[PDB]
Copies of this chain bind each other. A is one copy, B any other.
Amino acid sequence: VLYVGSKTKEGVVHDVTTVAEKTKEQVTNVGGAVVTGVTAVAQKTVEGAGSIAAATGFVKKDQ
Q: Are A19 and B20 in contact (CB under 8 A)?
A: yes
Total count of chain A residues near the partner, CB < 8 A? 63
Assembly CA distance A55 to B57 (angstroms): 8
- Contact flags A46-61 to B (C-beta < 8 A → 1, else 0): 1111111111111111
- Counting every copy of the chain, the complex holds 9
Q: Are A63 and B62 in contact (CB under 8 A)?
A: yes
Q: Are A8 and B5 in contact (CB under 8 A)?
A: no
Assembly CA distance A58 to B33 (angstroms): 7
Contacting residues, chain B, for A1 (C-beta < 8 A): 1-2
Partner of A42, one of B6, B42, B51: B42
Give the residues from 1 to 41 in chain A that come closer than 8 angstroms, CB to CB, to chain B: 1-41
